[PDB]
Scaffold this active site. Structure first.
Site, PDB file in Angstrom:
ATOM      1  N   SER A 213      36.902  57.244  39.774  1.00 41.54           N
ATOM      2  CA  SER A 213      37.294  56.826  41.162  1.00 41.54           C
ATOM      3  C   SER A 213      36.373  57.430  42.230  1.00 41.54           C
ATOM      4  O   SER A 213      35.899  56.710  43.182  1.00 41.54           O
ATOM      5  CB  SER A 213      38.773  57.149  41.531  1.00 41.54           C
ATOM      6  OG  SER A 213      39.336  58.299  40.860  1.00 41.54           O
TER       7      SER A 213
ATOM      8  N   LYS B 168      43.592  46.198  41.057  1.00 39.68           N
ATOM      9  CA  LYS B 168      42.253  46.351  41.629  1.00 39.68           C
ATOM     10  C   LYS B 168      41.528  45.004  41.532  1.00 39.68           C
ATOM     11  O   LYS B 168      41.871  44.090  42.267  1.00 39.68           O
ATOM     12  CB  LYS B 168      41.605  47.544  40.949  1.00 39.68           C
ATOM     13  CG  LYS B 168      42.367  48.797  41.346  1.00 39.68           C
ATOM     14  CD  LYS B 168      41.988  50.149  40.767  1.00 39.68           C
ATOM     15  CE  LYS B 168      42.977  51.174  41.345  1.00 39.68           C
ATOM     16  NZ  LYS B 168      42.973  52.469  40.671  1.00 39.68           N
TER      17      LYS B 168
ATOM     18  N   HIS C   9      38.807  50.979  37.204  1.00 41.71           N
ATOM     19  CA  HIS C   9      37.686  50.648  38.120  1.00 41.71           C
ATOM     20  C   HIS C   9      36.577  49.906  37.394  1.00 41.71           C
ATOM     21  O   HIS C   9      35.588  49.504  38.036  1.00 41.71           O
ATOM     22  CB  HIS C   9      37.158  51.914  38.826  1.00 41.71           C
ATOM     23  CG  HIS C   9      38.101  52.390  39.881  1.00 41.71           C
ATOM     24  ND1 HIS C   9      38.156  51.856  41.144  1.00 41.71           N
ATOM     25  CD2 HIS C   9      39.088  53.312  39.828  1.00 41.71           C
ATOM     26  CE1 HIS C   9      39.112  52.469  41.837  1.00 41.71           C
ATOM     27  NE2 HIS C   9      39.672  53.334  41.052  1.00 41.71           N
TER      28      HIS C   9
END
Lengths: 394, 394
Positions: free
Chosen positions: A184, A243, A212
């Site tokens: 992150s 996300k 991610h």
């Protein structure tokens, strides 16, 4: 009763102080869809602090799939998957995710956070070990503390430290290594080739958190094992839907026997209500689009390459990113809060990283790209960041 | 690598054995909205295993509020509330919940489960204590293990044991008592008058988990403190949105200073994406309906009183419920699985409770009422339960 409780919270003054100084910029109340521009206090603000890497929360096909699932299935399932909360569409999404990441089976959880808690809490027990990269996401830290195993951190991407710490452990014990795929904070990628080589030598299980990575790296966005070609050296692939996939929920994918154990033993799936029908459908429709429309990943990386080059040309000090997360060092907590609030007041949203999360000298703002950003918006944000970094005397 | 991981899961055979015997009835794939009847394998099944106490997951006004929020705000916020994931409508729902339970402030979490993790992990620390009813929900157990405090269980609703265990502790330490309001299993209510009396004597904080109380007990369904008149002796009111409120998410409500501490320190709200717009709107619209339309709570309790009286007339052995959860003792794991599957195959859905969760001699099925049940459906389910309990030789 509140006496000792009041004492426990009495020393927490940073928020009070930020508010009184006019610097407070947490929980900013957005009035519009998450997009490249958002409405805050009636005014337009460029959004460079999102995790919607592919800009899909505004895709009309995804909105309509979610609204259609509300029409058919209503607002909630009102139970855990284990009991009365499984729908045909949950099972569909598990089968589609299993195909996408190249594993036998998957189990959904109602958040990404809970997707870490499930495997980390219930696979390693008394007399076993969990090995964590020290920069692992909070949910991995917390999931491992819910196990009955001994949790050992290793130095960030430090393969000699991972190897040495594993070498010290009893042969007659189970081990699991859990790592973020893309981290992150600084946007860096785990050394998955060396970590899996060590894991194979010690017969340790390997879990990767691809929150991610999914939609970002790997073939058609399938994540970190896909990026390295190491599908067969990773036991567990965790992901979130919040996300790239523009929704809420998450999963863990792996071998059918492991996943069947997980879905009947993980407290975070036995004792928590299932994903809403709308989020199952939005995730299914987003997953189709990421694979069928390569332009979204394409455009995310053009925007990332363009913004990183512009930032370096203007002399900004960047962290060692390998992703659409561009960490811009400021190295003062006070200046980090000031820069964040000045940018907000000039119509640019970035995320601060400050003590006590990091040391003051490593404080930074995170500037994240979306596929849907334009070079014009990027240029306007970097123009304003140059002005504010000057005003702030960084 | 999978050697030791394969050994860790090797002894988990109950699911294998249930499947091979034709008894398996977990993760039943429902094909329709959660309602009094659901579609499974194309056939209609009476649903007596739900937590949708007010039947609101099918309310067209709630569906349409959720679809309208998708249209306006899209499929997700793609960040934690702390950063880019707060909407005006999250803050609205916090203000409305704070008014409903009679507290200064509230903070949303993306699940009920995470709503327990937040306060239990971050208020009591080193040298402090958490006191838990031994029957507390799994998420309370897990939240307390995420604290750095010493966790002490007390006997179920045992006020002498709670008092004695508190009496042993150092004066110069903080204490928090956390209890379910209505307990999931047996449907019983905490002794909140005595527990709050003890808490006041020891200056311990009091938190109540109202997952099964909200929409069930209290004025206009406001929960357990409201039921007893003890709003001013309960520091923290936790709830979920996945049961009466027909959605997903949860909250903790309390004094503004405590809630501000919570929303900036709880890892389960700093490091997890915010509730979807659709679930914020569905929860807001459900909360309006519970308060404005007293008939829903009215009808839940007529159905509960009718079904409990019918079950007792037919000679079923019920647990000490004070709620719409009717626990029906079977006292054999084998018979509990058999009865569950036989009822499924005859079009009745109930939830089994078996070892190792409970002792074999306390195994039971849980028959839960919804406001939207009819006396006809109740009579059909109890008719079939009498037939199956006979066939099973209970």
């Amino acid at each position: 009763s509140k006496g000792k409780l009041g004492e426990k919270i009495s020393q927490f003054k940073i928020v009070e102080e930020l508010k009184a100084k006019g610097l407070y910029a947490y929980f900013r109340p957005i009035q519009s869809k998450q997009d490249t521009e958002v409405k805050i206090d009636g005014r337009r603000v460029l959004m460079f602090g999102s995790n919607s890497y592919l800009g899909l929360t505004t895709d009309t096909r995804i909105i309509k799939a979610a609204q259609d699932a509300l029409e058919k299935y209503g607002t909630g399932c009102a139970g855990s998957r284990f009991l009365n909360g499984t729908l045909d569409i949950h099972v569909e999404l598990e089968e589609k995710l299993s195909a996408y990441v190249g594993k036998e089976a998957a189990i959904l959880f109602s958040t990404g956070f809970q997707s870490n808690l499930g495997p980390l809490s219930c696979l390693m027990g008394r007399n076993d070990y969990i090995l964590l990269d020290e920069r692992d996401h909070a949910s991995i830290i917390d999931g491992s503390r819910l196990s009955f195993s001994k949790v050992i951190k290793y130095g960030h991407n430090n393969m000699e430290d991972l190897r040495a710490k594993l070498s010290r452990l009893p042969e007659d014990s189970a081990k699991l290594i859990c790592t973020d795929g893309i981290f992150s904070m600084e946007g860096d990628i785990v050394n998955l080739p060396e970590l899996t080589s060590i894991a194979n030598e010690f017969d340790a299980a390997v879990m990767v958190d691809d929150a991610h990575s999914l939609g970002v790296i790997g073939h058609k966005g399938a994540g970190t094992a896909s990026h390295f070609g190491l599908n067969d050296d990773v036991d567990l692939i965790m992901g979130t839907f919040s996300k790239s996939l523009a929704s809420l929920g998450g999963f863990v994918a792996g071998d059918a026997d492991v996943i069947d154990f997980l879905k009947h033993n993980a407290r975070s799936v036995m004792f928590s209500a299932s994903m809403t029908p709308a989020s199952v459908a939005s995730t299914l429709k987003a997953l189709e689009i990421i694979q069928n429309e390569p332009e979204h990943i394409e455009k995310l990386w053009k925007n990332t390459d363009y913004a990183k080059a512009q930032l370096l040309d203007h002399g900004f000090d960047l962290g060692a990113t390998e992703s659409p997360i561009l960490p811009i060092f400021i190295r003062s907590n006070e200046k980090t809060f000031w820069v964040t609030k000045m940018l907000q007041d000039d119509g640019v949203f970035v995320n601060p990283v400050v003590s006590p999360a990091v040391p003051a000298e490593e404080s930074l703002i995170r500037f994240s790209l979306m596929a849907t950003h334009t070079y014009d918006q990027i240029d306007e944000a970097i123009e304003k960041m140059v002005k504010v970094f000057k005003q702030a005397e960084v």
